[PDB]
Design a protein around this ligand. Structure first.
Ligand SMILES: Cc1cc2nc3c(=O)[nH]c(=O)nc-3n(C[C@H](O)[C@H](O)[C@H](O)COP(=O)(O)OP(=O)(O)OC[C@H]3O[C@@H](n4cnc5c(N)ncnc54)[C@H](O)[C@@H]3O)c2cc1C
Ligand code: NI
Length: 384
């Protein structure tokens, strides 16, 4: 049985960035992940986009943490951590007059979420097709936003963890939390992999368990929020000849769901998707099906008609964990246990928001913390 200050449960990007942030303090920290490797779940199956903030409702935590999160990635995390990424602008395209006025709404949203005017540009049909000659010519309008990036979220999550690990954070994989009990004395005992006796005794739990973030709070008797799901399947295609894109192209999200794209990927291939299906089981959140490819053909070709979807390399899927009550991020202490911090409902744009989400996690522990004087935070993930 390890006694420790903080147990972080879940090794997606939220758990990993949390470990990184806490590694700068004098603390005994452990992170637990049920899989043999980190970032195998939602943080594996997403489009990797660092969103501008044009999209999320400005009154929600999604917008708030998008804004903070992105600044942190660009002006702090990218200076210290090496992993693949690239700067690439956002283009949202409209197909009729109703989608066209949605662009005007989106513009306003971006401004409300503090995007400078110089980054936003409404484009006519003609201007859009000049910028991106391979887009559907039946579009009527476009909205271009500079400032977005695309990263490999897997390599980023691992970089964060390795960085944390280098600064004395304990990372335990193949370790699934199966029971938690708060003690008379204020600490938790934690059982893993259904073992008989506890593996950990800790003062604080940071719940970053993705689709099981709700399960884990119910298990600690700490909060009773519930998540639902939205599963999205993608395809990656290659060998598209003369095809080029210098933007990530999006359908209007307001009409077609969040993050429906055709994007050029870091590896030179094109990502298409995703589909959308609500209410799949938690254990099914990454299952691919034979239904989805057909929807994917319609989505890709509507946006980039010269796309050949038979030139397909992989199919994969992921699901957004969605808080049932608020349809927003959950970033707070449990309502019924001030020592259990919840980072749940980590839907889009949780990746973009991550750094801000986890700094708030650190504050919600409500401790006077002492910095290690010899921390700088730098890690270059070797990759080629
Ligand atoms: C299709 C799709 C597209 C998206 N696109 C973007 C995008 O372009 N940009 C953006 O900003 N956001 C995007 N998002 C949102 C983003 O991917 C998620 O916000 C983020 O990955 C959530 O990370 P997480 O760490 O909370 O969850 P996860 O990555 O799911 O990790 C949670 C971890 O907890 C572990 N776990 C669960 N239960 C236990 C247990 N009891 N014990 C131990 N471990 C446990 C799991 O194994 C796991 O890996 C997208 C999401 C989806 C689904
Ligand atoms: Ni407002």
């Amino acid at each position: 049985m390890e006694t420790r200050d903080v147990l972080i449960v879940g090794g997606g990007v939220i758990g990993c960035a949390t470990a990184y942030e806490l590694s700068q303090y004098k603390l005994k920290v452990t992170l637990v992940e049920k899989h043999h490797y980190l970032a195998q779940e939602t943080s594996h199956a997403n489009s990797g986009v660092i969103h501008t903030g044009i999209d999320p409702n400005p009154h929600k935590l999604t917008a708030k943490y998008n804004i903070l999160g992105k600044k942190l990635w660009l002006n702090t995390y990218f200076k210290r951590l090496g992993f693949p990424r690239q700067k690439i602008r956002t283009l949202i395209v409209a197909f009729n007059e109703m989608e066209r006025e949605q662009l005007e709404v989106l513009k306003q949203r971006g401004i409300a979420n503090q995007i400078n005017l110089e980054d936003i540009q409404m484009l006519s049909k003609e201007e859009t097709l000049k910028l991106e000659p391979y887009v559907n010519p039946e579009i009527v309008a476009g909205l271009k936003i500079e400032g977005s990036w695309a990263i490999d979220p897997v390599l980023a999550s691992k970089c964060l963890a390795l960085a944390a690990q280098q600064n004395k954070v304990q990372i335990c994989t193949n370790t699934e939390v199966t029971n938690i009990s708060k003690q008379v004395d204020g600490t938790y005992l934690v059982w893993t992999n259904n073992e008989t006796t506890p593996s950990f005794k800790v003062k604080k739990i940071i719940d970053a368990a993705g689709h099981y973030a709700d399960y884990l709070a119910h298990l600690a008797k700490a909060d009773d929020f519930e998540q639902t799901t939205r599963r999205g399947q993608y395809v990656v295609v290659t060998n598209q000849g003369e095809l080029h894109l210098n933007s990530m192209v999006f359908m209007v999200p307001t009409i077609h769901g969040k993050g429906v794209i055709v994007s050029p990927m870091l590896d030179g291939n094109f990502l298409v998707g995703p589909t959308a299906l609500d209410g799949v089981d938690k254990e099914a959140t990454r299952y691919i099906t034979k239904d989805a490819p057909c929807m994917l053909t319609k989505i890709g070709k509507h946006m980039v008609p010269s796309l050949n979807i038979n030139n397909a390399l992989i199919s994969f899927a992921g699901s957004r964990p969605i808080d049932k009550a608020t349809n927003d991020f959950i970033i707070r202490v449990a309502h019924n246990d001030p020592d259990f911090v919840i980072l749940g409902g980590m839907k889009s744009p949780g990746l973009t928001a991550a750094p801000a989400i986890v700094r708030e996690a650190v504050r919600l522990l409500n401790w006077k913390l002492t910095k290690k004087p010899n921390w700088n935070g730098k890690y270059n993930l070797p990759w080629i």
